[PDB]
Amino acid sequence: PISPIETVPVKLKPGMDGPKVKQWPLTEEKIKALVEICTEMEKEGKISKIGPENPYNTPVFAIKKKDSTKWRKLVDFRELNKRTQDFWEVQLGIPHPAGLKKKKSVTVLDVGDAYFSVPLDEDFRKYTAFTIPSINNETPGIRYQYNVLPQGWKGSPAIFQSSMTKILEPFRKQNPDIVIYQYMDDLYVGSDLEIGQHRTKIEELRQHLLRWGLTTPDKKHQKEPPFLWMGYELHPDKWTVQPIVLPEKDSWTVNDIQKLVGKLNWASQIYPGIKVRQLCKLLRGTKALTEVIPLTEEAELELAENREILKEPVHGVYYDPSKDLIAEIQKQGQGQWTYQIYQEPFKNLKTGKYARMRGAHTNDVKQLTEAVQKITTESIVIWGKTPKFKLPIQKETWETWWTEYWQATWIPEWEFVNTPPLVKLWYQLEKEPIVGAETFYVDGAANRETKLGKAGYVTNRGRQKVVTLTDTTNQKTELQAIYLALQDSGLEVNIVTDSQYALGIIQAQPDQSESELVNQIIEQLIKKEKVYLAWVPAHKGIGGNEQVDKLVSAGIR
Amino acid sequence: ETVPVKLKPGMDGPKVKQWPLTEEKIKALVEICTEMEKEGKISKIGPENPYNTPVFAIKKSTKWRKLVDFRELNKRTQDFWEVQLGIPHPAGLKKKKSVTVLDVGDAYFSVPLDEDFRKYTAFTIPSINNETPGIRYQYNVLPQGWKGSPAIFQSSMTKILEPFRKQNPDIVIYQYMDDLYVGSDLEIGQHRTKIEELRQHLLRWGLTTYELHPDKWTVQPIVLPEKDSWTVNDIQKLVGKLNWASQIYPGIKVRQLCKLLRGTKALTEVIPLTEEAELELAENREILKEPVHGVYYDPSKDLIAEIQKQGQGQWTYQIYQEPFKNLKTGKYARTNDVKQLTEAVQKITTESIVIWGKTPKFKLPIQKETWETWWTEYWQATWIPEWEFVNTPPLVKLWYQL
Numbered sequence: 001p002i003s004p005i006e007t008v009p010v011k012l013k014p015g016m017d018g019p020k021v022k023q024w025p026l027t028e029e030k031i032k033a034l035v036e037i038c039t040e041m042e043k044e045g046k047i048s049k050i051g052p053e054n055p056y057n058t059p060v061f062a063i064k065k066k067d068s069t070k071w072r073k074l075v076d077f078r079e080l081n082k083r084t085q086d087f088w089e090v091q092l093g094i095p096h097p098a099g100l101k102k103k104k105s106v107t108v109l110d111v112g113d114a115y116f117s118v119p120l121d122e123d124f125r126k127y128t129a130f131t132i133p134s135i136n137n138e139t140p141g142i143r144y145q146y147n148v149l150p151q152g153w154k155g156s157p158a159i160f161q162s163s164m165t166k167i168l169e170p171f172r173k174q175n176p177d178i179v180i181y182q183y184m185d186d187l188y189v190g191s192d193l194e195i196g197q198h199r200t201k202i203e204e205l206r207q208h209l210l211r212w213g214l215t216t217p218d219k220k221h222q223k224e225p226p227f228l229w230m231g232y233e234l235h236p237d238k239w240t241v242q243p244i245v246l247p248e249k250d251s252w253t254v255n256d257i258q259k260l261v262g263k264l265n266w267a268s269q270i271y272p273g274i275k276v277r278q279l280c281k282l283l284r285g286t287k288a289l290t291e292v293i294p295l296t297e298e299a300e301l302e303l304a305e306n307r308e309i310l311k312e313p314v315h316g317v318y319y320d321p322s323k324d325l326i327a328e329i330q331k332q333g334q335g336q337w338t339y340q341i342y343q344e345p346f347k348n349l350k351t352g353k354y355a356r357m358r359g360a361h362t363n364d365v366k367q368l369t370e371a372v373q374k375i376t377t378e379s380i381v382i383w384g385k386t387p388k389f390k391l392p393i394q395k396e397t398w399e400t401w402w403t404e405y406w407q408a409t410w411i412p413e414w415e416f417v418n419t420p421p422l423v424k425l426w427y428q429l430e431k432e433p434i435v436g437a438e439t440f441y442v443d444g445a446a447n448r449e450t451k452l453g454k455a456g457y458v459t460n461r462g463r464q465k466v467v468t469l470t471d472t473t474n475q476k477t478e479l480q481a482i483y484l485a486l487q488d489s490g491l492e493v494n495i496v497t498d499s500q501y502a503l504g505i506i507q508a509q510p511d512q513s514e515s516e517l518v519n520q521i522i523e524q525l526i527k528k529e530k531v532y533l534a535w536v537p538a539h540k541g542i543g544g545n546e547q548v549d550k551l552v553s554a555g556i557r
Numbered sequence: 558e559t560v561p562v563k564l565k566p567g568m569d570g571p572k573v574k575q576w577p578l579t580e581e582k583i584k585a586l587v588e589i590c591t592e593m594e595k596e597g598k599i600s601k602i603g604p605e606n607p608y609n610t611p612v613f614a615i616k617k618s619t620k621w622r623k624l625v626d627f628r629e630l631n632k633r634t635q636d637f638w639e640v641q642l643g644i645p646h647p648a649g650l651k652k653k654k655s656v657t658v659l660d661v662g663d664a665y666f667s668v669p670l671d672e673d674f675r676k677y678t679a680f681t682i683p684s685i686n687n688e689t690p691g692i693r694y695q696y697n698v699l700p701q702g703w704k705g706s707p708a709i710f711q712s713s714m715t716k717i718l719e720p721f722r723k724q725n726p727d728i729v730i731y732q733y734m735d736d737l738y739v740g741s742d743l744e745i746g747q748h749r750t751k752i753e754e755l756r757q758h759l760l761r762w763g764l765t766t767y768e769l770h771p772d773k774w775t776v777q778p779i780v781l782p783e784k785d786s787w788t789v790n791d792i793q794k795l796v797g798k799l800n801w802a803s804q805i806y807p808g809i810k811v812r813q814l815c816k817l818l819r820g821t822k823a824l825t826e827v828i829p830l831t832e833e834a835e836l837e838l839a840e841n842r843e844i845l846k847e848p849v850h851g852v853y854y855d856p857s858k859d860l861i862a863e864i865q866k867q868g869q870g871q872w873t874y875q876i877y878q879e880p881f882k883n884l885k886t887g888k889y890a891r892t893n894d895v896k897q898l899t900e901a902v903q904k905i906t907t908e909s910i911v912i913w914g915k916t917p918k919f920k921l922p923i924q925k926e927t928w929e930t931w932w933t934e935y936w937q938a939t940w941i942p943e944w945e946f947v948n949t950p951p952l953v954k955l956w957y958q959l
């Protein structure tokens with residue numbers, strides 16, 4: 001049928017007129033196929049013959065069908081699509097299984113001939129005109145235009161979905177305790193009614209659907225659970241990802257490793273503890289897809305542990321709105337975090353991992369807080385509320401860090417849970433200068449052209465050193481100067497720099513970095529008992545800063 | 558009846574994604590929009606509308622209110638509300654002893670919106686877990702939060718306020734967005750009584766059946782401690798702090814003070830306070846107390862606000878148009894980092910509206926995502942300033958302590 005539903009008004013992009021692409025001459029067999037196909041469509045109202053006066057045209061092709069003797073028509077809507085108005089997006093996101101309420105029953109109904117069952121704005125059909133060419137282009141071809149939504153036209157997915165929503169509107173209104181998920185040309189229908197009253201509501205829905213042009217399968221032809229959808233496997237009381245097999249390979253190409261990482265990332269939303277860090281490192285660099293990459297031992301250890309995790313099937317449970325959501329996070333090391341979300345202990349709705357880094361230098365307390373933020377946003381999308389958190393960090397550790405740190409934060413309700421490794425601050429910078437601790441005035445400078453520099457220090461105890469550096473920038477030499485001070489000082493030490501840059505990094509109490517130096521600096525700071533770090537304006541003729549300035553400026557400034 | 562509105566050519570309308578909302582805020586929006594639709598103020602729309610602006614729920618105290626985020630549409634409409642139909646901002650408002658803010662947003666829903674413009678006011682109520690299509694609407698009347706609405710309602714407003722202004726020629730009334738700002742030099746009881754009167758006038762047209770003291774707004778100077786004894790550290794701290802001011806205030810001097818540091822001294826060492834030092838020291842205090850010589854508001858330039866977390870529930874802020882040429886600095890005090898930041902932003906936005914008739918773009922010391930999820934939990938205002946997210950330079954924080 002063609003749905004009696006009002007059409008959606010459609011316009012071409014302003015300043016633009018419809019397409020006028022020239023029809024290429026086809027073979028007779030393709031011309032015959034096309035004529036047969038269009039005749040059938042013409043009979044059912046899908047298309048209509050038009051006169052020669054329509055200026056517009058779009059190429060039509062025909063190709064063989066799945067290796068059979070069936071033919072299929074193929075319109076090239078590239079040019080119309082380029083000229084058609086933009087539409088609102090079909091879906092803003094897709095359900096996650098974990099957010100689906102526990103329910104008695106779900107029926108899937110697909111729509112037959114979806115696009116062709118919906119009318120096209122009449123004032124727009126003229127722009128969809130195509131021409132079936134006569135044999136070797138002797139005579140005027142046959143010309144049609146669409147009355148329904150074309151396959152491959154830009155507007156079809158959106159107008160189809162919105163037609164279905166209008167049609168569904170009253171049925172959903174009258175059936176509040178029935179829920180319907182629309183996906184493409186499928187319809188998932190769920191309820192807490194018992195079988196009979198459910199199979200009865202499905203027929204009422206089918207009938208309503210039919211009164212409106214949409215045919216659907218009957219109980220005999222309705223697909224049954226498990227539902228396979230967007231990579232998931234959906235059962236009445238549980239859900240998992242679709243089956244994942246990790247190939248046996250003597251040797252891995254870039255392409256095999258990419259696919260492996262893809263499947264592993266996908267499994268990680270319900271298989272806890274999946275890691276891809278070491279497999280990802282392998283992918284670094286521009287290499288051919290066909291290129292073989294030997295596995296490092298760390299990547300090899302990683303593949304094994306993932307293989308162990310995936311060996312036995314795991315499933316997730318559905319959502320009960322009357323119970324709380326609990327989210328637990330554990331540190332997995334090397335900036336890797338893993339989480340689980342459940343309502344009844346250890347029956348997970350879903351799992352996830354977080355292994356992002358924000359900035360070049362960071363600490364476990366920042367990272368944990370970013371993981372909580374990520375999980376909060378996800379929960380709001382999936383469930384419409386934030387979970388209760390269980391975190392591997394002491395309340396005192398967390399308030400010590402964030403009351404002192406210069407950026408604002410806030411994570412919702414959490415409780416400490418003792419699931420090592422615990423996150424802790426590894427050193428603390430002193431708040432006041434230390435009495436009876438040597439004071440190093442450090443500095444570093446690099447010649448912009450030479451690309452070589454110096455790093456050194458002067459001491460209030462008269463001590464001093466300078467070192468020469470290759471390939472260095474002004475930024476690096478200032479970190480290097482601070483590193484010297486820590487290497488050559490005792491357990492307590494005051495350090496005076498004039499590098500805001502260096503001050504910033506250290507001030508933030510990083511426990512991990514991208515920079516080799518910063519990690520050396522970090523290891524030092526941990527070994528110390530007290531460190532006080534202070535900043536002075538350069539070139540203001542200050543204190544000891546002036547001395548170490550010139551000592552290091554020479555050669556050259 | 559309908560004032561035709563153009564976008565700034567050749568800009569297209571707003572296409573901003575809807576941020577995720579909790580269940581209760583979604584439910585609240587459904588109730589509100591269901592009623593407004595019955596009342597003809599908005600209409601459901603089809604996919605042929607490609608536009609979107611975000612919508613949120615807030616409390617203003619027990620009731621939920623709809624807040625549409627028109628920052629993008631506003632930027633794209635700026636020829637209309639600022640240039641073609643601009644509303645003058647009185648310099649007298651900041652002078653008054655008392656300024657009361659009144660929400661007059663309900664006025665707009667009584668005027669129809671140009672039919673060729675309505676499509677740009679599209680918004681979307683999302684659904685939990687994406688299980689149902691967003692509910693899509695556009696506006697049929699002047700929407701709250703669009704800068705065009707007060708521009709268009711402008712002439713109706715002056716009609717409404719005419720008798721009251723005439724009877725009270727020393728009261729200043731300024732409309733900004735959904736709000737009326739009403740200032741006077743009356744004693745507080747007389748002022749409050751004059752507000753009730755104004756409400757009665759408004760009530761014959763539209764309003765149901767918040768109080769500033771701008772002339773008490775004074776700069777939060779860069780503080781130079783008065784100290785018992787000074788260490789090398791204290792001096793260095795001080796030079797770095799003065800050396801920073803010297804980039805802002807004409808006349809700042811440090812020379813007769815770094816002379817104290819000369820040599821390579823221990824941080825803890827005590828030091829004798831010179832006369833030359835304690836002289837300019839005090840003279841700089843003079844400079845820091847005053848407004849910045851040479852700095853003026855440029856109506857063509859955007860306002861920027863920077864905010865620093867000081868701890869103890871304290872927050873420092875500066876407003877400027879060109880960096881380090883401060884038009885205004887201040888502080889805000891007194892739980893929750895995000896809630897406090899949210900309060901400070903609204904307060905700074907408010908003073909900014911009173912003083913300049915313009916809103917600051919904020920540089921916010923917080924993670925984008927943290928702010929994004931939490932801010933509406935506390936936001937009470939009916940406008941939304943522009944913001945971006947920065948990591949505060951730790952030194953800047955130090956220089957604005959108390």
Ligand SMILES: Clc1ccccc1CSc1nnc(-c2cccs2)n1Cc1ccccc1
Nearest residue numbers: 095100106179180181188190225234235236
């Ligand atoms: Cl509960 C159930 C019962 C029998 C068979 C599978 C399931 C799980 S699949 C499911 N659970 N709820 C739903 C619905 C939610 C809203 C309307 S139906 N579904 C179907 C569904 C399939 C694919 C994506 C999202 C939901």
Ligand SMILES: [Cl-]
Nearest residue numbers: 255256259289
């Ligand atoms: Cl492949």
Ligand SMILES: [Cl-]
Nearest residue numbers: 011085605607
């Ligand atoms: Cl349009």
Ligand SMILES: [Cl-]
Nearest residue numbers: 745746749768
């Ligand atoms: Cl009072």
Ligand SMILES: [Cl-]
Nearest residue numbers: 768769770771
């Ligand atoms: Cl005040």
Ligand SMILES: [Cl-]
Nearest residue numbers: 852853854855
């Ligand atoms: Cl000025």
Ligand SMILES: [Mg+2]
Nearest residue numbers: 183184185186
């Ligand atoms: Mg499908």
